[PDB]
Amino acid sequence: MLTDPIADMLTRIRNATRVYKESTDVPASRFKEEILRILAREGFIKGYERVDVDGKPYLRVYLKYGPRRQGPDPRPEQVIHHIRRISKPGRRVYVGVKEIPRVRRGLGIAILSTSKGVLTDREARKLGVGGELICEVW
Amino acid sequence: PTINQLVRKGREKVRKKSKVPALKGAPFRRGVCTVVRTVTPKKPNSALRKVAKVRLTSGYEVTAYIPGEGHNLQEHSVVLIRGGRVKDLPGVRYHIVRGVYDAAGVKDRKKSRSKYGTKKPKEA
RNA sequence: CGGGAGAAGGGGUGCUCCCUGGGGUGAUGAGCCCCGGGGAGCCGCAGUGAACAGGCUCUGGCGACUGUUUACCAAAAACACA
RNA sequence: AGGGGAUUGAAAAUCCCCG
RNA sequence: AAAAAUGUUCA
RNA sequence: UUCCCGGGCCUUGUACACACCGCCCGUCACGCCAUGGGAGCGGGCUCUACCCGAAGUCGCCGGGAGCCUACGGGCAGGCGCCGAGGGUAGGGCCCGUGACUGGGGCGAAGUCGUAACAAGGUAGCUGUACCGGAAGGUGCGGCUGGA
RNA sequence: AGCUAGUUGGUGGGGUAAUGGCCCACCAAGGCGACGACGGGUAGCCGGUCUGAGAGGAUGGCCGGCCACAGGGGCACUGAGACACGGGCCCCACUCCUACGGGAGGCAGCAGUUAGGAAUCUUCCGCAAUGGGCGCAAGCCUGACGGAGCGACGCCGCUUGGAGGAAGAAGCCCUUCGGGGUGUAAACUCCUGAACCCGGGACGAAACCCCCGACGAGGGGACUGACGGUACCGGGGUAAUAGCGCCGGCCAACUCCGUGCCAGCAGCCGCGGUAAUACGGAGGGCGCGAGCGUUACCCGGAUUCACUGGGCGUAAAGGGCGUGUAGGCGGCCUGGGGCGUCCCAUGUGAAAGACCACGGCUCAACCGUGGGGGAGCGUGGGAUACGCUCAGGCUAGACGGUGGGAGAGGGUGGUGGAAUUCCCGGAGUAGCGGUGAAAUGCGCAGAUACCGGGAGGAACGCCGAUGGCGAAGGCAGCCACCUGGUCCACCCGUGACGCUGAGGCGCGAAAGCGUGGGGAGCAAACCGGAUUAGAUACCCGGGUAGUCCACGCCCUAAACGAUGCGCGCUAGGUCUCUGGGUCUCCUGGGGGCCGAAGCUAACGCGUUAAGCGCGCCGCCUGGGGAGUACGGCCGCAAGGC
Numbered sequence A: 001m002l003t004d005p006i007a008d009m010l011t012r013i014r015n016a017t018r019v020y021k022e023s024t025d026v027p028a029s030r031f032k033e034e035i036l037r038i039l040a041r042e043g044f045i046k047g048y049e050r051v052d053v054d055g056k057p058y059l060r061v062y063l064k065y066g067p068r069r070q071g072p073d074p075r076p077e078q079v080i081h082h083i084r085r086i087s088k089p090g091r092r093v094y095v096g097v098k099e100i101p102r103v104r105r106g107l108g109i110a111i112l113s114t115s116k117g118v119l120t121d122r123e124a125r126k127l128g129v130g131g132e133l134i135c136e137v138w
Numbered sequence B: 001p002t003i004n005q006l007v008r009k010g011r012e013k014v015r016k017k018s019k020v021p022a023l024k025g026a027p028f029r030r031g032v033c034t035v036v037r038t039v040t041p042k043k044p045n046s047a048l049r050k051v052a053k054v055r056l057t058s059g060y061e062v063t064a065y066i067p068g069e070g071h072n073l074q075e076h077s078v079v080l081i082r083g084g085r086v087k088d089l090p091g092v093r094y095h096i097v098r099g100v101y102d103a104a105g106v107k108d109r110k111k112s113r114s115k116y117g118t119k120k121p122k123e124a
Numbered sequence C: 001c002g003g004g005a006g007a008a009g010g011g012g013u014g015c016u017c018c019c020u021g022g023g024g025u026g027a028u029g030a031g032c033c034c035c036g037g038g039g040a041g042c043c044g045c046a047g048u049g050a051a052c053a054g055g056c057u058c059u060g061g062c063g064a065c066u067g068u069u070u071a072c073c074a075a076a077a078a079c080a081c082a
Numbered sequence D: 001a002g003g004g005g006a007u008u009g010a011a012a013a014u015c016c017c018c019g
Numbered sequence E: 001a002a003a004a005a006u007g008u009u010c011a
Numbered sequence F: 001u002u003c004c005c006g007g008g009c010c011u012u013g014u015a016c017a018c019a020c021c022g023c024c025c026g027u028c029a030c031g032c033c034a035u036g037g038g039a040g041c042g043g044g045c046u047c048u049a050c051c052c053g054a055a056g057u058c059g060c061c062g063g064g065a066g067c068c069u070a071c072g073g074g075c076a077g078g079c080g081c082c083g084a085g086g087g088u089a090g091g092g093c094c095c096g097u098g099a100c101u102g103g104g105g106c107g108a109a110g111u112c113g114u115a116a117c118a119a120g121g122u123a124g125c126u127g128u129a130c131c132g133g134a135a136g137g138u139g140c141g142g143c144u145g146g147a
Numbered sequence G: 001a002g003c004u005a006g007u008u009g010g011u012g013g014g015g016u017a018a019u020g021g022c023c024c025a026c027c028a029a030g031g032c033g034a035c036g037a038c039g040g041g042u043a044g045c046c047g048g049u050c051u052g053a054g055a056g057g058a059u060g061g062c063c064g065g066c067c068a069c070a071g072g073g074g075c076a077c078u079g080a081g082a083c084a085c086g087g088g089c090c091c092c093a094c095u096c097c098u099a100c101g102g103g104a105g106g107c108a109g110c111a112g113u114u115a116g117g118a119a120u121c122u123u124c125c126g127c128a129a130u131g132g133g134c135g136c137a138a139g140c141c142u143g144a145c146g147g148a149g150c151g152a153c154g155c156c157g158c159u160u161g162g163a164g165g166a167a168g169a170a171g172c173c174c175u176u177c178g179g180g181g182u183g184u185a186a187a188c189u190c191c192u193g194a195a196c197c198c199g200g201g202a203c204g205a206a207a208c209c210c211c212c213g214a215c216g217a218g219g220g221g222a223c224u225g226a227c228g229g230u231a232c233c234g235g236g237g238u239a240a241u242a243g244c245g246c247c248g249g250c251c252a253a254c255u256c257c258g259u260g261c262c263a264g265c266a267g268c269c270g271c272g273g274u275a276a277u278a279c280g281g282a283g284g285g286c287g288c289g290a291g292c293g294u295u296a297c298c299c300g301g302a303u304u305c306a307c308u309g310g311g312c313g314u315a316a317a318g319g320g321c322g323u324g325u326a327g328g329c330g331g332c333c334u335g336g337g338g339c340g341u342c343c344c345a346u347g348u349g350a351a352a353g354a355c356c357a358c359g360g361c362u363c364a365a366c367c368g369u370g371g372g373g374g375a376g377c378g379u380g381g382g383a384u385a386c387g388c389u390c391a392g393g394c395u396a397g398a399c400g401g402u403g404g405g406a407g408a409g410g411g412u413g414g415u416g417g418a419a420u421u422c423c424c425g426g427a428g429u430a431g432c433g434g435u436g437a438a439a440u441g442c443g444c445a446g447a448u449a450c451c452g453g454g455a456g457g458a459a460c461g462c463c464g465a466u467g468g469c470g471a472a473g474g475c476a477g478c479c480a481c482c483u484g485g486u487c488c489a490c491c492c493g494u495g496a497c498g499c500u501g502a503g504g505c506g507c508g509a510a511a512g513c514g515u516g517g518g519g520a521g522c523a524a525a526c527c528g529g530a531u532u533a534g535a536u537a538c539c540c541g542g543g544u545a546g547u548c549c550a551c552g553c554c555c556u557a558a559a560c561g562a563u564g565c566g567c568g569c570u571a572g573g574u575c576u577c578u579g580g581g582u583c584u585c586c587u588g589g590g591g592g593c594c595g596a597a598g599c600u601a602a603c604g605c606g607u608u609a610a611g612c613g614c615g616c617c618g619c620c621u622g623g624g625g626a627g628u629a630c631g632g633c634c635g636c637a638a639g640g641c
């Protein structure tokens, strides 16, 4: 019945990607799109858009992959080699402004929910705030 | 184990046993040699290792080994137990501190002597 | 598992005075009896002050048990018993 | 029981010989 | 669709 | 070419690998160590109850007795509650030790047989049940980690 | 694993500096507990300290802070303050004294003795400084303190020399007999000069006190040093201690002799059986050095209790299965509150220690000064994404409706045929049986084989599968009744009502047990016969409980897919059971095989996951001891948990 919808979205994404798919449709969720917007506003996916599978509103999420490769396993590298939820329903993960993560020595990101919106490992830091460490991509 | 479970049960700390009960975590323990026999090696060895049972201070009585060549412990010799298993003789879990109390140092040892309590000889 | 249980081991009990709770017949009130409870205070060596009135425990044997038996030496580990 | 010869890679075991 | 047990110790 | 002996390649099984002249099980004997049960015996901690009960505080009294007075009163002394501990009794918890008894561990070359690993030479194993020197045998049922 | 009588609360008192069953009457029956009450064990707490990359783990010795105690126990008095270590009273233990008539003492203060132990010091100097008590002050007391003494116990500084010196003494060890090594090491030559010797000699000490002013503010005068004739400065001045461990690998350092599974070594692996780099000595070498080793203990390495940071198909690990309580976790949208969460500010976070500088002793070790950081917690203001919460709404989760399906799902009652066994009857004769071969055994008292009639029990051939149903155990002849779950279709209803699940309750093969019934076949035990060295077995002939039924127990298992449940996501191919359709096809449910990506130690798994994820439960932590012992709970017992 889906306990944590968000962790799912990531997984749906983490799977569709691992096979190289055009787009994936994660179920409608304002807060979800946020992690999406951010996910794109940071250039991890071509983008997304609302749809409806018979009164069932989902969200097309277009995946971005790399260039074809030379040699065996000519499988194109991916934009997202790793996404994993942090704060889980079975163990909420909160962090203070000084506690925010440093994802992949800076190359990475760390979406998170804050009292004043949904920011990232830099944004939130710049805003100098804190909140539920939603997760981390890179 | 889930977190929730961890919250409930929780991990259990090991706590290990004393590889040698020489009482009050003591560097050494004194005692009288109740007997002084001569047992035999284990698994692949052959010889007549010299062992001696000892009535410790602590009303205890245990087998202790004896180092080097020759010695002089008798059925009633006071001695110092050091604590060092002799992996090759079942039971023997303590060595006798040579050159202490009734224990006589080793005669004519010239090499390692700190061990074996042999006095530093003069070369003249 | 009823029972071992009166296990064991203790403390109280007489007399006077004060207040008080329910009962039965009256009658719903009074005498009349019936069970209690709480405080003070008096006297002796001793208050179920005389008479009636268990000593106890641990541990073996035999027989399960209540019973029955040698009228007049044997009541049992014997007979009986479900 | 120890020691010696034979015997073994060295024993164990086995054969012969001693106060 | 099979008669038949065992083979000292350390290397 | 069935059968005895030895030898090729393919295959299968393997718990073997100084490799079946392999490996390996349990009883038994001997030695050392810890340990359970045990008629019990010894000591430590505690709980309950009632009997005696110091000092002392407090509460009465201070009467027909004493001491002081500035006559109100105070002290001494009397009684009571609380009370350390002591006694007797009956419980609870732990430690030591005990004739004998039960298994268990470990210890170069002692005894008996062959359970298991190759259909291990009756597939094996397993819950149960009975039985037998010992491994174990067999019954029912189960599993393949067997065919 | 249940605990509680001042026990929980109450009105009124008593008590106190004061709150309050702290205490006492009277009244009401409460109070606590799996968020672990009650009970046993163990323990002084913190600042910090040790280790770790950190998170953590361990620890609480010195110094600082809090508490507690003064031989064991109780009680008050005095007082601002005590139930008071060197004050008091009593009881107890202990030791002592005595004129034997009674009394005395309380080092867990300093030092010292004895006992115990592996082991822990001088019966030191001084009040000069700091601090404390009394006094107007002079000043008195101060084993607090300030110093000294003892121990490589620790830390730090420092010495046993420096520069030359042979194509290289001697001695000793190797030696392919040339030589190689110790080794510039030495001797020897020059220079420096710890020790020792003589001379000088402290800081720490300015106050209190005396005079002027006012005995104040400000100024002037005087006394005082335990350590110590020590530090330290100057002069002279002699080459002036080295040891311990190791050298097979891990782990840096090798050769000879002795010894011969002996003697011995040994942290784990291991070495020694007559050429040992492992034992013992030697030459040599490596390491550290007034130390070097050993034993003990803590952290580490050990992501080996795993939050960081692990696991359970075969390695230890899924509960035998189900139902469900507490608890844990929870779809989509709009708004209110703002507990979690987050930000700001402020209080706090002693000093010491830890980190950064800078200075003080010749340096350092110690030490001073300044700076910088501290989680946590309180108060004040603010934010609202996420968790929480209240409120309003929705239909993708979940449940229901109408209509149908398949199935060995379960319970009861009845019923059919095949076969086996026995009974009667007929017919018939010399063996049948069983085996590897046999024997036991059955048979002239008439068997086996054949037919007919009859009784009774138990199992259900073909269909049948590589299938189907059930949560598991498990469920098969046929029929009817009673009843569970599950699948499809129709978009009808409810509107998150959900997932999981400690404990609990139920079910739970076979074997086994209780009361009663039944009994053909088979069959532990048992008895014979063979086999064999033996055969308490395998094979043969007999045979009871049991296997069956009713009702009630036991509750285990290779109770296995050896794979917890729920949901989501991630190529296909193939055959098969079952449902629906404008039916060569499309779509739903289940069982098998092969396999994408990916996972795995490998084997293998692979939309029926062991892939990628989330929620919740269960469980694992080397092998043997042992699923044993004890305790508890259950059972009639066997036994189980």
Ligand SMILES: NC[C@@H]1O[C@H](O[C@H]2[C@@H](O)[C@H](O[C@@H]3[C@@H](O)[C@H](N)C[C@H](N)[C@H]3O[C@H]3O[C@H](CO)[C@@H](O)[C@H](O)[C@H]3N)O[C@@H]2CO)[C@H](N)[C@@H](O)[C@@H]1O
Residues within 6 Å of the ligand: F026, F030, F106, F107, F110
């Ligand atoms: N580890 C042994 C344990 O006890 C048993 O094993 C014990 C016995 O079976 C075994 O005895 C063996 C014997 O089996 C074998 N056939 C002959 C051998 N000589 C005996 O040996 C025994 O005794 C001699 C002295 O006589 C000792 O030196 C030796 O160490 C010891 N194991 O000795 C063992 C005790 O050391 C179990 N069977 C075993 O499964 C269990 O694990």
Ligand SMILES: [Mg+2]
Residues within 6 Å of the ligand: B042, B043, B044, F108
């Ligand atoms: Mg051996």
Ligand SMILES: [Mg+2]
Residues within 6 Å of the ligand: B044, B045, B046, G261
């Ligand atoms: Mg050896």
Ligand SMILES: [Mg+2]
Residues within 6 Å of the ligand: B084, B085
């Ligand atoms: Mg050791």
Ligand SMILES: [Mg+2]
Residues within 6 Å of the ligand: none
């Ligand atoms: Mg009796």
Ligand SMILES: [Mg+2]
Residues within 6 Å of the ligand: C007
């Ligand atoms: Mg009695």
Ligand SMILES: [Mg+2]
Residues within 6 Å of the ligand: C014, C015
């Ligand atoms: Mg009278």
Ligand SMILES: [Mg+2]
Residues within 6 Å of the ligand: C048
């Ligand atoms: Mg009488």
Ligand SMILES: [Mg+2]
Residues within 6 Å of the ligand: none
């Ligand atoms: Mg009479």
Ligand SMILES: [Mg+2]
Residues within 6 Å of the ligand: C063
């Ligand atoms: Mg009788």
Ligand SMILES: [Mg+2]
Residues within 6 Å of the ligand: none
């Ligand atoms: Mg009678």
Ligand SMILES: [Mg+2]
Residues within 6 Å of the ligand: C069, C078, C079
């Ligand atoms: Mg009679």
Ligand SMILES: [Mg+2]
Residues within 6 Å of the ligand: none
């Ligand atoms: Mg009579």
Ligand SMILES: [Mg+2]
Residues within 6 Å of the ligand: C070
């Ligand atoms: Mg008579």
Ligand SMILES: [Mg+2]
Residues within 6 Å of the ligand: C075
């Ligand atoms: Mg009688």
Ligand SMILES: [Mg+2]
Residues within 6 Å of the ligand: none
């Ligand atoms: Mg009589």
